[PDB]
From a paper:
Acid-sensing ion channels (ASICs) are a group of voltage-independent proton-gated cation channels belonging to the degenerin/epithelial sodium channel (DEG/ENaC) superfamily. These channels are involved in diverse physiological processes, including learning and memory, neurodegeneration after ischemic stroke, and pain sensation. The trimeric hASIC1aΔC shows a canonical chalice-like architecture. The ECD resembles a hand-like architecture with the palm, knuckle, finger and thumb domains clenching a ‘ball’ of β strands.
We also report here the structure of the human ASIC1a channel in complex with the snake peptide toxin Mamba1 with resolution 3.90 Å, reflecting the toxin-inhibited state of the channel. The overall architecture of the hASIC1aΔC-Mamba1 complex shows a triskelion-like shape viewed down the threefold symmetry axis, with one Mamba1 molecule radiating from each hASIC1aΔC subunit. Different with the PcTx1 and MitTx toxins, Mambal1 was observed to interact with the thumb domain of hASIC1a channel. In the tip region of Finger-II, Arg28 is oriented toward the α5 helix of the thumb domain, thus becoming closer to Asp347 and Asp351. Phe352, a residue that is conserved in [name] orthologues, is nestled within a hydrophobic cluster composed of Met25, Phe27, Leu32 and Leu33 in Finger-II of Mamba1, mediating a hydrophobic interaction between Mamba1 and hASIC1aΔC. The snake toxin peptide Mamba1 contacts Asp347, Asp351, and Phe352 located in the α5 helix of the thumb domain, causing these residues to flip outward from the acidic pocket. The α5 helix thus deviates by ~5° around the central axis, whereas the α4 helix and the finger domain adopt the same conformation as in the apo-hASIC1aΔC structure. In the TMD, TM1 undergoes a lateral pivot of ~6° around its carboxyl terminus upon Mamba1 binding. The transmembrane pore of the hASIC1aΔC-Mamba1 complex has a diameter less than 2.0 Å in the gate, indicating a closed channel. Therefore, we conclude that Mamba1 inhibits hASIC1a through a closed-state trapping mechanism, precluding the previously proposed allosteric-based channel modulation mode.
Numbering used by the authors:
A (entry chain D), B (entry chain F), C (entry chain E): 1 to 57
D (entry chain C), E (entry chain A), F (entry chain B): 48 to 465
Write the structure that this text describes.
Amino acid sequence: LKCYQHGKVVTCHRDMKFCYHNTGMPFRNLKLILQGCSSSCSETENNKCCSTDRCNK
Amino acid sequence: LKCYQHGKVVTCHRDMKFCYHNTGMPFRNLKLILQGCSSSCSETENNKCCSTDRCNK
Amino acid sequence: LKCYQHGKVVTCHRDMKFCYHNTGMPFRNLKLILQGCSSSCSETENNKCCSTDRCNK
Amino acid sequence: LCFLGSLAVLLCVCTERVQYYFHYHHVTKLDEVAASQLTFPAVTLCNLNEFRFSQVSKNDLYHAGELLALLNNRYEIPDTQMADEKQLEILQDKANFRSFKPKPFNMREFYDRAGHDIRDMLLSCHFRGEVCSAEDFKVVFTRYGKCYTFNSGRDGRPRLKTMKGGTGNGLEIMLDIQQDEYLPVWGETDETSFEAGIKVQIHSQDEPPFIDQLGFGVAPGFQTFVACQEQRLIYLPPPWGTCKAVTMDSDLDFFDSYSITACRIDCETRYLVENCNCRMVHMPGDAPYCTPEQYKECADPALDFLVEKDQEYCVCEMPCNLTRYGKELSMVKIPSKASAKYLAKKFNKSEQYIGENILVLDIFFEVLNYETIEQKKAYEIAGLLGDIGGQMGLFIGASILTVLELFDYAYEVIKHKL
Amino acid sequence: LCFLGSLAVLLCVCTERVQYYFHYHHVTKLDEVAASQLTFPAVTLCNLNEFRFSQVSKNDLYHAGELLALLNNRYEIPDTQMADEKQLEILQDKANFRSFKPKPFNMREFYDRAGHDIRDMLLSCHFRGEVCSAEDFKVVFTRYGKCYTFNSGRDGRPRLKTMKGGTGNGLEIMLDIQQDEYLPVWGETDETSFEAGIKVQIHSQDEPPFIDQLGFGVAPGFQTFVACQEQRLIYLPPPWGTCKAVTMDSDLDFFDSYSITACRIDCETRYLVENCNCRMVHMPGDAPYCTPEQYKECADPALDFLVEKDQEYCVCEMPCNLTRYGKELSMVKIPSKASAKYLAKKFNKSEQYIGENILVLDIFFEVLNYETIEQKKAYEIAGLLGDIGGQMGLFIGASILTVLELFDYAYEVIKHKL
Amino acid sequence: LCFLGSLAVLLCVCTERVQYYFHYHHVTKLDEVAASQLTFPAVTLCNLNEFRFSQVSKNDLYHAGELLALLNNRYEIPDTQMADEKQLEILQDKANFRSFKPKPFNMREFYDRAGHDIRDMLLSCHFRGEVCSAEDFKVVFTRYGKCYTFNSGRDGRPRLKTMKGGTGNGLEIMLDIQQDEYLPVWGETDETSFEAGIKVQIHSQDEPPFIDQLGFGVAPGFQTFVACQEQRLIYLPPPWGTCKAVTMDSDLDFFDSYSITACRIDCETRYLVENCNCRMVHMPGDAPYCTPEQYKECADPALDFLVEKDQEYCVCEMPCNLTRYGKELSMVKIPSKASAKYLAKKFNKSEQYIGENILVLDIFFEVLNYETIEQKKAYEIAGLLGDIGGQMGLFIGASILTVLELFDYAYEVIKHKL
Ligand SMILES: *[C@@H]1O[C@H](CO)[C@@H](O)[C@H](O)[C@H]1NC(C)=O
Ligand SMILES: *[C@@H]1O[C@H](CO)[C@@H](O)[C@H](O)[C@H]1NC(C)=O
Ligand SMILES: *[C@@H]1O[C@H](CO)[C@@H](O)[C@H](O)[C@H]1NC(C)=O
Ligand SMILES: *[C@@H]1O[C@H](CO)[C@@H](O)[C@H](O)[C@H]1NC(C)=O
Ligand SMILES: *[C@@H]1O[C@H](CO)[C@@H](O)[C@H](O)[C@H]1NC(C)=O
Ligand SMILES: *[C@@H]1O[C@H](CO)[C@@H](O)[C@H](O)[C@H]1NC(C)=O
């Protein structure tokens, strides 16, 4: 799995599953922008947990 | 060599020779009870330095 | 390369080139006597930077 | 005429290559698995003092005055001379024995209230930022007295994990060792220990702690970053190497899993029960922890024979799922001149008490790595026939089919010829 | 009738031996190259305090009183209670704000004059006997504040070398940590650090320093011989192992070479610029170091989310030219009772100031060795056909020429026969 | 037409496989031999001071006042200013030289009575419980002055052994370093050493001690458990690796066995005897230890050229029976507040003298293991013909018997045909 990180292609660890994208997860008085590799999806509003390569665009 | 230790079968080290049994070796105001692997026999009264497997019963 | 060191044959390191002999290199109020392996020659007066084996005699 | 002379050249190379199999040689392979989850190793820690001074009573002094190494065998303060005045005043007052009636005694009860409680040793336990507390420490018993254990894995609590490196992602324990309440040492014995610090052993969850013979030390007044790097070992069963790989029920008389540390404790329990039916409080079993007066006849010299035999009396072998932990210390002086008057105000203590009795452990993984060192058998049976055919494919050329059809050659020799 | 029965014995051994190739097993080899020249590893060192006390002004307190963790959000001394009298007198005098007009602020300017200058930290830098000086230390910026770097290799200065072992052939740095000018800590926060010492990370020249997560510590008042032994690592590209072996332009957005440390800094720069266009002073880039009041809304929680996610948010892989450095500490107490009154006279300082604020690093190679650990692929393609022929030279006897001339056998089967 | 086209495919694979032999590649194998007996490594230890202060006389000051680095070249106290009053009173009284007649001088006699006697350094030597004594320490001479050696193995005493792990089964040496009798350091030279502790090198019995360039340090006021784990190394002779495996008489001009440490001392002895027929007291030989006034012309700069050449002047190679010793320190603060007034009463010393000048080494094996790392040649001659036959058994099918009977084919070509 070789999906993106802020404009750089980066392979994941071979134990790690599908990656994701998020313009959310507020956590404070703020609205974060996250993108990276992952192992657990929590798709409610924008967590695009797509298991295809180069999916986060 | 796989002789006993207080009711458990236990292999010795491959450098170690015959094992033994002893209801003796006083050493204090007491009469000890010993059993284990060894490399030197001192058979005077009860040191059964038998080189057969499972000999200490 | 297996040239001498004060009367003992000694191989050099395989990265190290020609060895030498010197009854010079004053450096103080003295006139030194040096002999050993080396990697750079500076032959002015007596630095016999000969690249043959057992050359320093 | 020459085929007989090349078969012996085959037979010499075949005999050495079948004896090369009977050496059971083995090579070893080192990897670095960049893992993503790692289990935290179980940290245990013991104070270097066995019984605190301000929590022993008259009957504890009357029943075990010689086991405390404080009293005379005829029940007096033996060398009460030129030690102290505050220690000596409280000593003779709790050693009067003027019509002091005795009480029922129990050694396991003595170690539960005269050791070191963790509620006043520990000041701040941490884990990755979230605030650890006091009841995460499973109490254990070993030879230094009362000892605690972080991340035990037993009694229902799961095994904690970590997923980040660096110094901010492990324990940060600000302990306190209380040097004032150590035992007075105005006497002189063979077991005398002048030191004052904590012994800490890092191990996996399956072995019981063995602080007597495997733990390092951490000095007070020095915060010590202790790195870690988890290793994994896989050894081979005999005759390649040595294992107790049969893990159905090998020697687990009081435990569940097998380990080289748990062998020696199970040894020293089964030996002592065969002598006077005792066990010490650091010995797991079911026979009763025996009376202090009975300790002096049988239980003391039976174990002091073990430290004098000049051999490991009870032998065993290592298992082959061993996980060690390599460590790399470093020290930083803790009670700073900027930070002196805050810690004395907060923990309600003196100023000079800070610079002597404050210790800060800090244990963390360095890089999330996995250094596995395993043994593999280097000449298996399936490589024997594969290497028996390199030379007969070169020397004589004959395949085994030329020997397999040589059976069909024999039909015309025993049936038709004779 | 039997040749069909031996071909399946060949086909089973051939299928496992072509699947043994698809495991991509690898063995590793350890050498000890007795080298003759070795490059000195770049030593960096940071004080454990971020901003000195005696070099902050009114406007620095007015603009960043909450980032200093010294002031109230409504601009007062919050817990100014029972700390000191000399610290408290100078504090309220530089925190009056009675018609104190503000000034233009810049955080990069604040760290250049309120950190720790090396001209009064360092006292005696050495290298193999010849006297090192103060301007050999390239200034760097990391999370502990202002940090220095010996033997950087950048900015035109070449990489220094060493050619002899022993303690007399490396650095001998008599530092001074100045515990008087630490920040007062009468408050209490989550980032509070009571310690007082130097964190020192030894690394190769290509990685930027990462003192937060890889450096050990050296306590003051103790000269610590720190040995070294240079290792070299060669890992393999996938699917054998993992490398970013393509080094044309992999991720070097602000650096030139690739390393596992420089991945995380390049990660945390590119993440923060995608949130509020800031960067901290320890973040290489081109976007502006942003205002202190803007740090409190966006820049603070965006990075404190990173220390709370409980995963490495940005992943990458190790390169395969790694050179680590194994270390082995040891300590010797420096300010001797013979040498007390000379150091206080020479450096013009007190007596008790010596035994608290003097540190002597001493880093040197032990033996000029080279411990290389490389990975080699253990079943290549050229060993496949070499080991496909051991069994067919044994089972059936047939070479591939008997299959190569079997094509010439087929000319008499399709042309002449049919 | 095609057999010529498959022979070149054989010839390419055969040429690379005979050049693979000429690389002399080698793999290395790591075991863990669970041994039962282990020999104790020879511990040496040196104080960091060369000559004690209270045992030098007038003529020692008159003859070697400049070698002591205490006097003026025109025989005066050079910088006798603002050091001390008790040191300065005894200094000018033993440096009067008012009609002080000189005496016959000998440097070897000076080091035997002005170094550090072990009878007042050592307080309690132990070994596995049984009480070690003072005369087990063979006196040796190295560059720090007078140094001692436990478990030497020479002079008739056998090599001691150990058979149990743990902290209670090795040395427990309560040393004393006597900081009061260090040299006064009110001057300033290049060799000035402010520190005060013990340098301790653990080595095998065959190498002479080399404390200058291989030993760690132990600080006073800290009991340091020093673990050990015995390694064994087997290197290979050239052209596989490098050995001086010929051990008949290689370079043993003043020793018996060969070692990389004993090479450099034998070098620096044979070099200095070729310059002015001197030797220092730490140089084994037969030429006389020369006069102090003669040291200043020839013997001083001939050796200070050696520390300036920026190369190892005399090279050699490592042997291949090397036994190293890996170590892992840890520290515990010794003079406890409970144990302060006993040690001051027993050894008849002050209270503040205890916390500065008491050191407790403690060296012990951790687990009775044996980590052997040996080099084995990976492509021998007997594997060459074994791997020359995998391809000719596959490419052409021809055995060497088809070449061996090709000689019998040639009888019908040169005799009958022509
Ligand atoms: C023991 O080792 C085997 C082989 O490595 C492994 O699969 C297994 O999980 C291990 N068992 C335990 C309980 O660790
Ligand atoms: C704080 O210490 C003093 C001094 O002994 C004591 O009187 C007081 O009770 C202590 N406070 C608490 C809450 O323990
Ligand atoms: C990277 O590794 C290769 C193979 O070991 C080596 O030849 C090369 O010099 C290395 N490059 C750098 C920049 O270190
Ligand atoms: C030396 O220290 C004293 C004490 O503060 C000071 O007055 C004096 O100026 C200092 N000397 C120098 C050269 O800094
Ligand atoms: C040298 O090495 C050989 C081979 O390992 C060994 O048999 C021999 O005992 C060693 N000799 C000495 C003196 O250690
Ligand atoms: C003990 O120390 C005192 C103080 O110097 C001294 O007078 C006395 O002689 C010492 N005792 C012995 C036995 O050395």
